[PDB]
């Protein structure tokens, strides 16, 4: 591999907590307003998916990809087959960026995910500013995001590239409490769980408690379906097939607070992988929800 690239965080000129809380608020207000999307699930889940896809390209071996450069705005990454459907999240963020043109693309994509998690009643995610747009030729090639038709050994190896351990993997996957698979996007179809747009630990409870059947969907792909009408990907279900993952699933199924704390740590880490924060950078921001502000 090549010598690691160095990506030093640089605060948008003159900006501070209050500026980023205003961007958060605009995202949160649009989440509330544009609530018809995807049969009234709203844009929360796709924004969290967008944050994972734009951060999940990172390669610890050469520090390519990751959230820093905001490269999803370029054709090669925008048109990654793995990114099908994310254009809806990008379009959601367009008026936000128009109102706050000074925020970097990487800061906006990652802050979109933080805002969505918190506004869906998830844990506070501390968030740092200072990602800087990088040129088109820094865009990572397609193929760095994970396949869903795979087992636990694949999941474990894949996430080593993001410097995630077993606990971080199981915690991050809890985001599949949110939203659904869409046959036209991914070859999988159905809601993951019951609430769809409230962040809870129901991913782990459903894995353990539902009666899952391995079925074939209308795209001829196998997926796990329950009589409650939920589905899980093969990679999701692998978390109760592998004995080490299963232990952690049981822990989170039995401790909502522990899941929230571990998810918040692993999600912040995901959004910050590859970034060098200078010694005198601002501390991470913890944004108030609209509810906490009375807005
Ligand atoms: C092995 C790892 C993962 C695999 C294979 C995977 C795969 C998928 C697939 C196939 C979909 C359906 C997309 C569609 O049809 O619209 C999806 C949706 C989603 N993913 Fe994952 N994912 C993984 C990890 C993650 C992580 C780590 C996060 C966030 C921390 C995340 C957040 C989401 C969300 C919120 C959705 C719902 C999107 C929507 O409703 O539009 N995923 N994932």
Residue numbers in the entry: 0 to 294
Quoted from the paper:
To resolve these uncertainties, we replaced Trp51 of Saccharomyces cerevisiae CcP with 3-benzothienyl-l-alanine (S-Trp), a close structural analogue of tryptophan that cannot serve as a hydrogen bond donor, using an engineered pyrrolysyl-tRNA synthetase/pyrrolysyl-tRNA pair (PylRS_S-Trp/tRNAPyl), which selectively incorporates S-Trp in response to the amber UAG stop codon. To gain insights into the origins of this reduced ferryl heme lifetime, we replaced the redox active Trp191 with Phe in CcP and CcP S-Trp, which allows the CpdI and CpdII states to be differentiated spectroscopically. Oxidation of W191F variants of CcP and CcP S-Trp with H2O2 (1.5 equiv) leads to the rapid (transient) formation of a CpdI porphyrin π-cation radical at similar rates in both variants (k1 = 126 ± 1 and 122 ± 1 s–1, respectively), as indicated by a substantial decrease in the Soret intensity (maxima at 406 and 407 nm, respectively). The CpdI states of CcP W191F and CcP S-Trp W191F subsequently decay to a neutral ferryl heme (CpdII) with rates (k2) of 24.2 ± 0.1 s–1 and 6.93 ± 0.01 s–1, respectively, indicating that the S-Trp substitution stabilizes the CpdI porphyrin π-cation radical. The feature at 791 cm–1 is also observed in the CcP S-Trp W191F double mutant. In contrast, proton transfer to the reduced CpdII species (ΔGH-transfer = ΔGPCET – EAII) is 6.4 kcalmol–1 more favorable in CcP S-Trp W191F.
CcP employs a heme cofactor to reduce hydrogen peroxide in mitochondria using electrons from its biological redox partner ferrous cytochrome c (cytc). CpdII reduction is coupled with proton transfer to the ferryl oxygen, with the distal pocket His52 as the likely proton donor. Here, we use an expanded genetic code to examine the impact of hydrogen bonding interactions on ferryl heme structure and reactivity, by replacing the N–H group of the active site Trp51 of cytochrome c peroxidase by an S atom.
